[PDB]
Amino acid sequence: KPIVFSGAQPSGELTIGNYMGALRQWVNMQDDYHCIYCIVDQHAITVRQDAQKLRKATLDTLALYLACGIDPEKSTIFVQSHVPEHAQLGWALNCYTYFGELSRMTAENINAGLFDYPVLMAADILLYQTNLVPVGEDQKQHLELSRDIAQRFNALYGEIFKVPEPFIPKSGARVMSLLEPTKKMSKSDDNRNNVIGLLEDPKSVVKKIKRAVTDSDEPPVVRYDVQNKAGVSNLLDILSAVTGQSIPELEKQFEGKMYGHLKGEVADAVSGMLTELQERYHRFRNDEAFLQQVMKDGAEKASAHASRTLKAVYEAIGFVAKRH
Amino acid sequence: TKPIVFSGAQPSGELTIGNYMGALRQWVNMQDDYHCIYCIVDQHAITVRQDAQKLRKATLDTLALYLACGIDPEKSTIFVQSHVPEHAQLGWALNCYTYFGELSRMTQFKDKSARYAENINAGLFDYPVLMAADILLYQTNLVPVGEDQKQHLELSRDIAQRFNALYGEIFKVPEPFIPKSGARVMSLLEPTKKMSKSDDNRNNVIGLLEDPKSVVKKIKRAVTDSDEPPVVRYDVQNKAGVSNLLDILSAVTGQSIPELEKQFEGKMYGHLKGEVADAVSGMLTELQERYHRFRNDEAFLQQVMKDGAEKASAHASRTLKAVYEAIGFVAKR
Ligand SMILES: Nc1ncnc2c1ncn2[C@@H]1O[C@H](COP(=O)(O)OC(=O)[C@@H](N)Cc2c[nH]c3ccccc23)[C@@H](O)[C@H]1O
């Protein structure tokens, strides 16, 4: 059974694009793979931020992943800082990473964490003998560095690490920005009218969907055409992703209908989906004991695996073994 | 409670009389006066590529050498860096409060990079941050080092101050403890270059575990100057070799430079080198005698490492817990 590693930032406010895209895909593959979800608080601190908001955001992210359907009895979910082995391997791998490799990632006032985090990312993955890593385009370089580091270390010391591969197949749910339908909906957009977050209430959803750009076709026609009708196509894709109705089925359903009707149904569909998600979220988020047990159990599972890899790394390097 | 002393040395190369005079001598002398913690920094050692068997052996060599010098495991905490995860943990966190420019300007990074062009690695660059973590974990007040580590120590102070300014009284701001003599012992055939523990030319070096007979021969061949008549006088600019020999002699015997200058009046470099050789040969003979008793007693070295890591972990975990609470991490259950 292959091992899958995903880093979850405790700062991102997840959108319907994040959910209906990758997360929903992965919630349904927890028996197919040994999935690991690491809430990366040690990566978060490369950007200076309020301490109390970071603690809150870590717990927010945990509860939301649980709400979306990550099962802590099937998958391993934990907070990065709870497993010392990440920092330990991070340091070790620094010594097998060229300074040039970090500088060549795509000046004097930048903090060393922002410079060095790709090595920590490599450590995060390689600790768990990870086979597969779902990456977006923005972190393809980082995965390649982790593969380069793994092969370099293995060439010196034997087959200590698995060489991880990208998880290639995409979710098959297309969710674009509401005011810029050529651009994908992304959690890190400054214009939050482009996105629908998972904790938005029905009034917020109605508002943002009514502002979503369409086209000046006369008569208005609800037909799928990414080139000529980007906005209307996005609303159709969003609706299809929520309900499971095909694009041709929806095109037939909205025959002789204006964009107001489409928008009305999209908002209703999206909010119907978010209601069950939000119910589970607030239930988990307000249960301190549950979250504490999930984190404790997750860190214990992670540590047991991570320690085995780190011991092999340390033995290969030649460090004197700790005396327990 | 007593103020805290922390210092470390790398289990790589072979420790010299420079390492001893600049650091280890002070370490031994501070043990009653302060609460002392001494570390074999194996995680720093691997910033220069090590053979795995050499690294393991050198770690244990270094531990036995600390004990041979007079570091007493009943008085001081003695441990191996990699045995305490908190070093790497705090090492990562302090990267986020250290600037790229502070690290790129470091003399050691530049010198080591020029030397090891084929392995200019991120560990070598990030070296000072892990060092700051090493110090700051133990609420350290004093850090006994040689002159060459002054720049690194200064950064650790800046990091402590910067972090404290944001979060409260989390770290002590450490102070350097650099000796008046022997802070920067120089190479015997190149006295404008500091004595290296990994020199390609062994004739530059007085190794702590080297045959005393070999060391005496090296002292006799140490370069001096062309002064006519020869005069034993301290002048680093014009008499680097003679000055370095006086510095070594002063550090061994405890005698001042004015005292030695007076003592060598009417004498030349034969007397100087004879006295340097006698003093150093005697020190190393004694040192090496103790060393083998410790080095071949694996049960004792194993127990010192166990007890030391236990003591260190108690201090380090406390500091790391406060750091993690301050920056906003969810506390581990
Ligand atoms: N020619 C010389 N003359 C006088 N002193 C010298 C000479 N060469 C070296 N030293 C001093 O020896 C100590 C150990 O040096 P290392 O290279 O092992 O090791 C080093 O240079 C440290 N980075 C190890 C370290 C890691 N973390 C720490 C925290 C606190 C103090 C020290 C450390 C040092 O005090 C060094 O200044």
Author numbering:
A (entry chain A): 3 to 108, 118 to 335
B (entry chain B): 2 to 334
Quote the paper:
Tryptophanyl-tRNA synthetase (TrpRS) links tryptophan to tRNATrp, thereby playing an indispensable role in protein translation. Unlike most class I aminoacyl-tRNA synthetases (AARSs), TrpRS functions as a homodimer. Each EcTrpRS subunit consists of a Rossmann fold aminoacylation domain (AD, residues 1–85, 140–183 and 299–334), a connecting polypeptide 1 domain [CP1, residues 86–139; CP1 was combined with AD in some previous studies (37)] and a C-terminal α-helical domain (CTD, residues 184–298). Therefore, TrpRS is considered an attractive drug target for developing bacterial-selective inhibitors for fighting microbial infections.
In this study, a crystal structure of full-length EcTrpRS·TrpAMP was solved at 1.80 Å resolution with R/Rfree = 18.6%/22.2%. The asymmetric unit contains two EcTrpRS subunits that form a functional homodimer. Intriguingly, two subunits of this EcTrpRS dimer adopt different conformations. A copurified tryptophanyl adenylate (TrpAMP), the intermediate product of the two-step tRNA tryptophanylation reaction, was observed to bind to one of the two active sites of EcTrpRS. The shift of these two motifs couples with an inwards rotation of the CTD around a short hinge linker located at the beginning of the CTD (residues 184–188), which makes the TrpAMP-bound subunit a closed active site cavity and a more compact overall conformation (named subClosed) compared with EcTrpRS bound with L-Trp and AMP. In contrast, the active site cavity of the other subunit of EcTrpRS dimer remains empty, and this empty subunit displays an open conformation (named subOpen) similar to that when L-Trp and AMP bind. Aligning subOpen and subClosed by superimposing their ADs shows that the anticodon binding site at the distal end of the CTD of subClosed moves ∼6.9 Å towards the active site compared with that of subOpen. Thus, this EcTrpRS dimer is in an ‘open-closed’ asymmetric conformation unique to all the reported structures of bacterial TrpRS. A short CP1 sequence (residues Gln109 to Ser114) is disordered in subOpen but forms an α-helix in TrpAMP-bound subClosed. We found that the distance between the acceptor stem binding helices of subClosed and the anticodon binding site of subOpen perfectly matches the distance between their corresponding interacting elements on tRNATrp, suggesting that tRNATrp is able to bind to EcTrpRS in this way.
